[PDB]
Amino acid sequence: GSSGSSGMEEIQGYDVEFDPPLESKYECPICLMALREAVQTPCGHRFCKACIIKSIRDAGHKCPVDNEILLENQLFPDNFAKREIL
Ligand SMILES: [Zn+2]
Ligand SMILES: [Zn+2]
């Protein structure tokens, strides 16, 4: 009379650690990553020339942070030149 045999096993591994990258540069509150073009806004914020363009066509003329009536044409403040039907 052996009566077979039984047992039990449990393996676990917890660990809560992380190293935050150097955040010493205005980041994009839209995509949450390094600015693509690094374009500024007239309202008073900084976003990716691409992100800002998507936010407008996506939702509409509004800031992704303050939702303030903002237009595209009113962008590209970094450019020290305004070539208009020159
Ligand atoms: Zn972005
Ligand atoms: Zn804004």
Side-chain angles (χ1 to χ4, degrees):
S2 70
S3 194
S5 273
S6 284
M8 210 81 149
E9 284 177 290
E10 297 162 307
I11 301 83
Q12 276 288 303
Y14 39 71
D15 173 276
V16 50
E17 268 287 325
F18 53 102
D19 319 299
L22 273 78
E23 204 188 335
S24 285
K25 203 188 89 172
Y26 205 127
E27 198 168 27
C28 186
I30 298 172
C31 59
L32 306 171
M33 73 151 59
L35 304 150
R36 213 284 202 91
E37 288 278 329
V39 70
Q40 193 152 322
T41 43
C43 69
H45 286 119
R46 209 189 191 168
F47 319 100
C48 310
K49 178 163 164 164
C51 287
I52 177 56
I53 285 172
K54 208 172 161 160
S55 76
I56 298 169
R57 67 192 277 156
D58 165 32
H61 302 121
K62 70 91 160 78
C63 198
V65 281
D66 45 82
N67 315 271
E68 286 207 340
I69 301 291
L70 157 72
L71 309 174
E72 291 179 283
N73 168 283
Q74 291 194 11
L75 292 168
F76 323 138
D78 33 54
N79 203 9
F80 88 112
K82 303 176 156 168
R83 206 154 179 203
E84 57 188 45
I85 190 156
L86 199 290

